[PDB]
Amino acid sequence: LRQEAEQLKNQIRDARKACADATLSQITNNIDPVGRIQMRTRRTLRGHLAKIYAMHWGTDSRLLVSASQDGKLIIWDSYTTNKVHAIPLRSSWVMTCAYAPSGNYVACGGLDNICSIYNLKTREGNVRVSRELAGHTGYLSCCRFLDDNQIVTSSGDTTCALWDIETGQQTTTFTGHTGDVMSLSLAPDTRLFVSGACDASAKLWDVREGMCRQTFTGHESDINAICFFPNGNAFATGSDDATCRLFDLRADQELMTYSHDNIICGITSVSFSKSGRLLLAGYDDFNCNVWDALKADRAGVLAGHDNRVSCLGVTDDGMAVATGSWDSFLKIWN
Amino acid sequence: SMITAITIMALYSIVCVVGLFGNFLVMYVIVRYTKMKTATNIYIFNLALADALATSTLPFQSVNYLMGTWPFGTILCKIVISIDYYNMFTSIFTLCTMSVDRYIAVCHPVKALDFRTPRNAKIINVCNWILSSAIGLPVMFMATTKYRQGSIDCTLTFSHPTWYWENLLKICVFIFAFIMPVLIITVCYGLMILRLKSVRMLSGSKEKDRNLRRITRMVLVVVAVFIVCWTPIHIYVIIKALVTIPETTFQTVSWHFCIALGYTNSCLNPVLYAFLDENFKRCFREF
Amino acid sequence: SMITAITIMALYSIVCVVGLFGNFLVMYVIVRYTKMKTATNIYIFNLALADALATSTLPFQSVNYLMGTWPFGTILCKIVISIDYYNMFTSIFTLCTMSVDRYIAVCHPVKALDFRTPRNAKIINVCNWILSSAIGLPVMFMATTKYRQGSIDCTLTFSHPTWYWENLLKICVFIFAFIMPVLIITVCYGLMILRLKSVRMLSGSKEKDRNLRRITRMVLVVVAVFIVCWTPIHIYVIIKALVTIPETTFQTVSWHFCIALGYTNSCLNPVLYAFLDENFKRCFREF
Amino acid sequence: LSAEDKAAVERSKMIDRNLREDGEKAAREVKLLLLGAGESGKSTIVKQMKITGIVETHFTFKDLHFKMFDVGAQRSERKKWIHCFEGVTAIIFCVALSDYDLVLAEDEEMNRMHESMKLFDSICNNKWFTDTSIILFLNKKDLFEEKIKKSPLTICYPEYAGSNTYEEAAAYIQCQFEDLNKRKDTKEIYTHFTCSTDTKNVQFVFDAVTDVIIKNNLKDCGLF
Amino acid sequence: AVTDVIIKNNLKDCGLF
Amino acid sequence: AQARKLVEQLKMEANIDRIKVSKAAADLMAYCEAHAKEDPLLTPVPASENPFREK
Amino acid sequence: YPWF
Amino acid sequence: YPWF
Amino acid sequence: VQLVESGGGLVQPGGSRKLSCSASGFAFSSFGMHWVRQAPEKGLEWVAYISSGSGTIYYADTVKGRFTISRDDPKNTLFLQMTSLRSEDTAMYYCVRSIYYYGSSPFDFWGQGTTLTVSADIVMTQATSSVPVTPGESVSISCRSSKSLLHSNGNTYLYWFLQRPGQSPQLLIYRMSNLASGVPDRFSGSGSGTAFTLTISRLEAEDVGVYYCMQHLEYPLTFGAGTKLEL
Ligand SMILES: CC(C)CCC[C@@H](C)[C@H]1CC[C@H]2[C@@H]3CC=C4C[C@@H](O)CC[C@]4(C)[C@H]3CC[C@]12C
Ligand SMILES: CC(C)CCC[C@@H](C)[C@H]1CC[C@H]2[C@@H]3CC=C4C[C@@H](O)CC[C@]4(C)[C@H]3CC[C@]12C
Ligand SMILES: CC(C)CCC[C@@H](C)[C@H]1CC[C@H]2[C@@H]3CC=C4C[C@@H](O)CC[C@]4(C)[C@H]3CC[C@]12C
Ligand SMILES: CC(C)CCC[C@@H](C)[C@H]1CC[C@H]2[C@@H]3CC=C4C[C@@H](O)CC[C@]4(C)[C@H]3CC[C@]12C
Ligand SMILES: CC(C)CCC[C@@H](C)[C@H]1CC[C@H]2[C@@H]3CC=C4C[C@@H](O)CC[C@]4(C)[C@H]3CC[C@]12C
Ligand SMILES: CC(C)CCC[C@@H](C)[C@H]1CC[C@H]2[C@@H]3CC=C4C[C@@H](O)CC[C@]4(C)[C@H]3CC[C@]12C
Ligand SMILES: CC(C)CCC[C@@H](C)[C@H]1CC[C@H]2[C@@H]3CC=C4C[C@@H](O)CC[C@]4(C)[C@H]3CC[C@]12C
Ligand SMILES: CC(C)CCC[C@@H](C)[C@H]1CC[C@H]2[C@@H]3CC=C4C[C@@H](O)CC[C@]4(C)[C@H]3CC[C@]12C
Ligand SMILES: CC(C)CCC[C@@H](C)[C@H]1CC[C@H]2[C@@H]3CC=C4C[C@@H](O)CC[C@]4(C)[C@H]3CC[C@]12C
Ligand SMILES: CC(C)CCC[C@@H](C)[C@H]1CC[C@H]2[C@@H]3CC=C4C[C@@H](O)CC[C@]4(C)[C@H]3CC[C@]12C
Numbered sequence A: 001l002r003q004e005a006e007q008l009k010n011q012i013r014d015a016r017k018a019c020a021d022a023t024l025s026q027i028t029n030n031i032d033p034v035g036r037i038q039m040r041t042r043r044t045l046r047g048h049l050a051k052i053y054a055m056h057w058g059t060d061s062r063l064l065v066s067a068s069q070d071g072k073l074i075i076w077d078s079y080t081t082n083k084v085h086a087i088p089l090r091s092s093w094v095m096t097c098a099y100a101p102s103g104n105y106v107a108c109g110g111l112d113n114i115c116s117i118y119n120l121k122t123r124e125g126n127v128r129v130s131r132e133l134a135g136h137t138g139y140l141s142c143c144r145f146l147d148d149n150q151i152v153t154s155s156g157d158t159t160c161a162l163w164d165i166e167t168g169q170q171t172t173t174f175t176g177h178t179g180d181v182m183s184l185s186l187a188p189d190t191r192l193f194v195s196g197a198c199d200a201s202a203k204l205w206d207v208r209e210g211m212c213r214q215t216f217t218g219h220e221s222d223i224n225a226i227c228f229f230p231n232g233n234a235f236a237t238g239s240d241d242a243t244c245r246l247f248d249l250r251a252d253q254e255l256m257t258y259s260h261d262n263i264i265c266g267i268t269s270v271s272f273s274k275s276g277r278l279l280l281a282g283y284d285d286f287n288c289n290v291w292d293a294l295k296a297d298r299a300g301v302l303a304g305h306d307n308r309v310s311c312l313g314v315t316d317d318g319m320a321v322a323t324g325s326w327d328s329f330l331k332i333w334n
Numbered sequence B, C: 001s002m003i004t005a006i007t008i009m010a011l012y013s014i015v016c017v018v019g020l021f022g023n024f025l026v027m028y029v030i031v032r033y034t035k036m037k038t039a040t041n042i043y044i045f046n047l048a049l050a051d052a053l054a055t056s057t058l059p060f061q062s063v064n065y066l067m068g069t070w071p072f073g074t075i076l077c078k079i080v081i082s083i084d085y086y087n088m089f090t091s092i093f094t095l096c097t098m099s100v101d102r103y104i105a106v107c108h109p110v111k112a113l114d115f116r117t118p119r120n121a122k123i124i125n126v127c128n129w130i131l132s133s134a135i136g137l138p139v140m141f142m143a144t145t146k147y148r149q150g151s152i153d154c155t156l157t158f159s160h161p162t163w164y165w166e167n168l169l170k171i172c173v174f175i176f177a178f179i180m181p182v183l184i185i186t187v188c189y190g191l192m193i194l195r196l197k198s199v200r201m202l203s204g205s206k207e208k209d210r211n212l213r214r215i216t217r218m219v220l221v222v223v224a225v226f227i228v229c230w231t232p233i234h235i236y237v238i239i240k241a242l243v244t245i246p247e248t249t250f251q252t253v254s255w256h257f258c259i260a261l262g263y264t265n266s267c268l269n270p271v272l273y274a275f276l277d278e279n280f281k282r283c284f285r286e287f
Numbered sequence D: 001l002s003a004e005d006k007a008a009v010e011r012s013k014m015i016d017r018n019l020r021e022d023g024e025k026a027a028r029e030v031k032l033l034l035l036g037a038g039e040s041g042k043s044t045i046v047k048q049m050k051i052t053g054i055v056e057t058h059f060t061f062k063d064l065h066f067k068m069f070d071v072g073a074q075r076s077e078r079k080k081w082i083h084c085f086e087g088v089t090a091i092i093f094c095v096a097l098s099d100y101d102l103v104l105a106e107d108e109e110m111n112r113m114h115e116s117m118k119l120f121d122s123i124c125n126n127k128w129f130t131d132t133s134i135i136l137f138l139n140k141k142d143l144f145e146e147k148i149k150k151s152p153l154t155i156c157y158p159e160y161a162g163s164n165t166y167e168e169a170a171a172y173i174q175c176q177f178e179d180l181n182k183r184k185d186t187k188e189i190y191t192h193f194t195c196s197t198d199t200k201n202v203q204f205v206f207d208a209v210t211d212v213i214i215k216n217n218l219k220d221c222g223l224f
Numbered sequence E: 001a002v003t004d005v006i007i008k009n010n011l012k013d014c015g016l017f
Numbered sequence F: 001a002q003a004r005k006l007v008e009q010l011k012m013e014a015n016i017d018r019i020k021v022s023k024a025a026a027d028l029m030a031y032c033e034a035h036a037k038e039d040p041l042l043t044p045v046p047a048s049e050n051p052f053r054e055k
Numbered sequence G, H: 001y002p003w004f
Numbered sequence I: 001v002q003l004v005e006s007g008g009g010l011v012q013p014g015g016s017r018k019l020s021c022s023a024s025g026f027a028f029s030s031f032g033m034h035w036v037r038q039a040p041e042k043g044l045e046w047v048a049y050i051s052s053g054s055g056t057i058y059y060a061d062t063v064k065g066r067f068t069i070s071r072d073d074p075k076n077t078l079f080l081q082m083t084s085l086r087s088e089d090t091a092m093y094y095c096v097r098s099i100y101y102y103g104s105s106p107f108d109f110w111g112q113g114t115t116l117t118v119s120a121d122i123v124m125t126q127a128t129s130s131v132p133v134t135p136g137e138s139v140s141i142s143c144r145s146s147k148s149l150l151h152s153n154g155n156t157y158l159y160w161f162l163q164r165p166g167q168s169p170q171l172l173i174y175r176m177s178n179l180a181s182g183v184p185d186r187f188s189g190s191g192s193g194t195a196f197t198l199t200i201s202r203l204e205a206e207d208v209g210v211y212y213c214m215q216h217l218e219y220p221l222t223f224g225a226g227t228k229l230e231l
Helices: A002-019 B004-034 B039-056 B058-067 B074-107 B109-115 B118-142 B162-198 B206-242 B249-275 B278-286 C004-034 C039-056 C058-067 C074-107 C109-115 C118-142 C162-198 C206-242 C249-275 C278-286 D003-028 D042-050 D112-124 D141-150 D166-179 D198-221 E002-014 F002-014 F021-034
Strands: A041-045 A052-057 A063-068 A072-077 A083-088 A096-099 A105-109 A115-119 A129-133 A142-145 A150-154 A159-164 A170-175 A181-186 A192-197 A202-206 A212-216 A223-228 A234-239 A244-248 A253-258 A267-272 A278-283 A288-292 A298-302 A309-314 A321-325 A330-333 B143-148 B151-156 C143-148 C151-156 D030-036 D055-060 D065-070 D090-096 D133-139 D189-193 I002-006 I009-011 I016-024 I032-038 I044-050 I057-059 I067-072 I077-083 I092-098 I116-118 I130-132 I139-144 I158-163 I169-174 I187-192 I195-200 I210-215 I227-230
Touching (some): A002 F002, A063 A096, A072 A105, A072 D003, A083 A105, A083 D003, A159 A181, A192 A223, A223 A267, A234 A267, A244 F021, A253 F021, B004 B039, B004 B058, B004 B249, B004 B278, B039 B058, B039 B074, B039 B118, B039 B249, B039 E002, B074 B109, B074 B143, B074 B151, B074 B162, B074 E002, B109 E002, B118 B162, B162 B206, B162 C109, B249 B278, C004 C058, C004 C249, C004 C278, C039 C058, C039 C074, C039 C118, C039 C249, C039 D198, C074 C109, C074 C118, C074 C143, C074 C151, C074 C249, C074 D198, C118 C143, C118 C162, D030 D112, D030 D198, D042 D065, D042 D133, D042 D198, D090 D112, D090 D198, D112 D166, D133 D141, D133 D166, D133 D198, D141 D166, D166 D189, D189 D198, I002 I092, I032 I067, I044 I067, I057 I067, I139 I227, I158 I187, I195 I210
Parallel strands (some): A096 A142, A181 A223, D030 D065, D030 D090, D090 D133, I130 I227
Antiparallel strands (some): A041 A330, A052 A063, A063 A072, A096 A105, A105 A115, A115 A129, A142 A150, A150 A159, A159 A170, A181 A192, A192 A202, A202 A212, A223 A234, A234 A244, A267 A278, A278 A288, A309 A321, A321 A330, B143 B151, C143 C151, D055 D065, I002 I016, I032 I044, I032 I092, I044 I057, I067 I077, I158 I169, I158 I210, I187 I195, I210 I227
């Protein structure tokens, strides 16, 4: 039984070895390097007195939400530096926040094991709690809106769930990860999502069937971050061994490895530009390094965050990049 | 509120009547007879005016104690608190100025020819009222009325932190109204007594020694009345500020007795300074 | 004017160079690295600014001593005298405010949560500069230039009588810059040391006892430098005011040594306060 | 700017004032982390002080606001969410003295006292808690007295050779918890044998928190 | 002698004498 | 029983159609080259078109 | 002083 | 202070 | 969400009257408050505005000085103080809540209106006055302005209102690109600066009323004449 499982794993590894014929770094030699990419701060955003953990971009690319330890979800106006909403929180400890695609709802989650959905287009004028999602035995680490009625959450009890917001209960349960699931991202077609856990594995999931499609085991220690490529066939992954790895769904193997000698700090977040050519990551050495999808070098350096970088996300159209740090400031990099 | 309240109200009523009668009697004698042609009479008139304005705030405090709330309004709360805090420092600075006047008059006579002029007395008195305006004006700004337990409270409100500015006000009032005035009065009158006993004219015969003993006794009575009146209320306010004490009937009686002595000094400053003044004694004897 | 004048000019030149270098170095470190995000760094910046503005008046005094007359004009005489008298009280009030800050930080921690905020530090520092403006402005009004023996003299002119207002200014500066600050600093740091030895955390082991001895030594060095620097010049000004002394070369050397120590404290306040500050030590160690 | 842009800037300044007021309220309040096993007596000590996510307890003693966060409900890996609690005033670590005879009910192969020693070793030597003091509570002291009278301490830990005495065994277990600290200069261990009286239990926390605030004020002044 | 006369005049002016 | 579930999930994962990595790499390079002009981060936007401006 |  |  | 006004009736000229509007079912402290008056045989007209937290206060030039506006957030009551009323103030006064942020819909909820009868600048131009229409055909309504409302940020501050006969007016289209919450897809706004067009496909009997075009580019707010439809 266990020996048969080891033989099947050996067979899958042999199939992965047989599939690969050419290294991707040899193929990308033809395309030119991007050169130095210099980004200057456009806006300096304030109003947080506590540690920022997460930020989700709006679809219109102007609105953004931010999660902090002051008990506040503060929705901002990126262009005019105004504060659109300020949501008082019941649980101070928050580790994630999501913005709906329609713009109607805002989620948050953390150590209280409760996902709170906040309505923004109410007639009363105050952002109140619409639905409290409960039933997690572990801390919520990431949540993303599929729709105004569906949301996919990652939790600390090794269980990812799909939530019917109108019903208030979970529809599809996803299990199989050894260790808590640190993050998740949604594909553009929204029919599949991939989540990385702390057994150095990232498992592709299907919303409809509910069974695990693929699993990649190219990481040494653990996964803090995961983000899809814009086409929906690739995803770069962030880890604590100072490496970033790119995995192809169709090829079912590791495309590229990102590493550099003096950097030993872990990766908190990764993101992609509009084209997908630029891979932007967040590190623990107070420095954000912009990478290249094909050439695998460093295109730019983002600095100016006093405390450790919690999160980083590139907006929908690609006009701006706002980086989340623990110094209670979000800075917008164009 | 059976015997203690009536006793306290009667005590403050007697204190207010005696103080207003003495102050307006001294001001009436100075206006109708002296007309302020001498520097010392200008200091006595400013002392009587400061003590009258300090005693005028006492019926408002009596009504505040008897009712338990402030019905007079915010503006009159500001005016009466500003007049009280202003004129205590005005009266004490007038006392220190008269001590300095007598010290210069005895010890430095050639320079007292420059000092003891009516113009210089008017300039130093206007400077005393201006220096008292430094404690008068911000206390006027800070005073508001706040509802406490359904009762209006006429008090002082400080910017945050409240405890720091409140203890700063209490300690600044304590130092500038007790520590420096007792030392200035004590040292100036002590060196004055040393110079007066050094004077050959005051010694020599039994009558002159009797008059020297009378002057030294008058000076010691002035210093003793000032210290004995202002010492317990200041030490008791410092002890109340430092250590929280349980509310007791005897605690309240000691509190109002110390405040009664504090106003009693302003009441008896005419009796010590103007009534025992020999020039005013001649003025009463002629008329 | 053979050796003594050159010695005095070289001494004040070294004092001015060391003071300006230390003050602008501390202000440069605070601006380029700290950016005043903490209350204690705001107090250190205001201390460095007050000491720099006090040390800036020293080359004008050096030129006045070397030439023997004031060629700078009446307006610059007013400005430099006002800045000197203003910023001495500003620096000393900043020292007293930092003493009160450390006393509240050690002895009253729950209230130090209210006190040790950047907004409260800005409010108390603005109040310190405003309270120093009370000695800054009338000294600016009174300063004029008068011809004495064919030489222009940059000094203060008082209304008649000159002796009374002059001794009043000298004694008020003496009391408010020496008597109250030495007592406030000594009592606050002494009770601070008593509370620190009362702390269980500081005692217990050899390393923690060594650090407690280092903190107590630092506090005693601060208090000793303040007292040893400001004591002789104040006592010597009081002795010169009281008793007329014949002009002697040693008298002049002692006068300029006491003034040199008085400015030397403002010069060494960066060395004691900012350079020995452990947060600034970490800032220098990182860069 | 248009009229709606001006009104939006006005709304943003009002939100800035509300956030500044809430931050000034939150900065004064003291946050305390509650740690230990489930059967250590967290509920008992919390209900004494008062008189499945994070249980938050608010209580005020001597004009000082306390936040206590009970993390015992979560069953997830602690290493990934322990970095959130970096800016905490002190660690309240509660264990029971009677755990040495009671075998753990997970594998029935390890004493609970040694599991609590490993728990304290993981918390104390954490990279995120370097200057954060640990407030140690030793629970069930009367049951520890009866248990030490019935059964000797020598059976749980073979190396210990001290005589069967209540005070000696209590002082040895206290020194055994203190020995686990590897950075003793910048990290205090405040140990209190938990009593029935609520006032002493709250007073000990107030004294430890007051000492930590004194240390933090010395850090901010820089004399320390 | 003159100083004592001025002291006597000042004491009469104050009225303590 | 849990090991049987792991073996069953491993068997479900094993039978999957895998395309050549070179063709998917060509698809990735084509998607990167095609949308390079649209990306604001790659090619700097003029200030009039840029919504973020100096104030 | 004081007020009551 | 003082001035010279 | 409900706003009711009290304090009406007949008022002598030169006197004084203090109105009070009570708010229920929404957070009163977060909305800015407008007063809008309506003559009996003329269109609507703006009176005054107070912001949330009483930060800024605006008046029209014809009503400046005589009228005093205040608000109390713990009591959730809006107060209008009237001093030295004239013969032109015989109008019905409405209370309006308005939140202001990016994507907000101000002027969304209108009050009921209190009757007040007394007994003795961007000019918005309605080109038409009354158009007889039939239910089913498309209806075209045009409004014109004296100033280009296209602001440099891209927003065009033109709001469209419908006042049904015997009922309070409601918001239809705000900022000319967005439909109000509760308004169907039958209404649509189009046009540019100084030339605007309103189109109503699938005409309904409830849609029949008085149509107003309102600018919000600068204070004082000046309204339209009012295009009324009939059957
Ligand atoms: C509200 C009041 C108490 C504030 C203080 C008023 C000050 C400005 C008033 C009150 C007492 C007044 C003095 C009273 C007596 C004299 C003596 C007279 O021959 C010259 C004017 C002079 C010297 C007055 C100057 C002005 C004065 C000092
Ligand atoms: C020798 C005599 C004349 C010195 C008198 C100095 C007096 C007038 C000055 C010096 C210090 C000043 C105080 C400094 C600080 C405060 C705290 C403020 O919140 C209220 C005003 C108050 C209390 C000031 C009042 C006036 C004050 C007390
Ligand atoms: C302790 C501080 C706060 C206040 C001190 C005030 C008193 C005690 C000080 C201030 C001015 C001082 C006086 C200054 C000048 C003289 C003239 C001299 O020929 C006799 C001593 C005498 C009179 C000093 C005695 C002490 C004195 C009166
Ligand atoms: C020496 C003479 C002239 C003055 C003495 C003043 C001081 C020492 C006296 C006068 C009033 C006294 C206080 C009167 C009332 C109380 C309340 C009591 O529950 C504690 C003691 C206490 C607080 C006393 C302490 C001593 C005290 C403050
Ligand atoms: C020198 C000037 C500017 C500031 C002087 C500050 C000193 C005197 C102030 C600041 C902090 C204050 C203390 C703060 C807290 C308390 C506890 C209270 O229950 C009794 C009063 C007491 C003990 C205050 C006494 C006065 C105090 C020590
Ligand atoms: C001619 C000059 C010296 C007169 C005094 C000027 C006063 C008004 C100036 C000089 C020093 C200045 C302070 C210096 C530093 C800070 C810290 C900064 O984060 C806020 C402003 C603040 C608190 C300043 C407030 C204004 C200030 C107090
Ligand atoms: C505790 C500290 C803050 C108290 C400081 C009080 C200072 C600022 C006040 C109180 C007494 C005031 C002095 C009173 C009298 C005079 C004489 C006048 O001809 C020049 C101004 C001068 C010298 C004033 C300057 C300012 C002054 C010294
Ligand atoms: C002598 C006059 C001129 C100035 C006196 C200033 C100093 C010595 C005074 C003024 C404020 C006083 C403090 C007032 C409050 C407290 C808090 C108490 O828990 C310890 C003593 C302590 C700290 C006092 C000690 C002495 C003190 C610091
Ligand atoms: C104790 C230490 C730290 C400080 C001592 C300061 C005082 C006591 C010292 C320092 C300067 C000294 C003065 C120096 C010069 C003279 C001029 C001489 O013709 C008479 C003595 C006299 C006036 C000295 C008296 C004592 C003195 C004032
Ligand atoms: C309390 C404040 C308002 C006033 C204080 C006045 C006192 C301290 C002033 C007034 C008179 C002054 C004295 C007047 C004359 C002389 C003679 C001179 O050769 C030495 C200084 C000396 C001895 C002065 C010392 C200071 C002095 C005593």
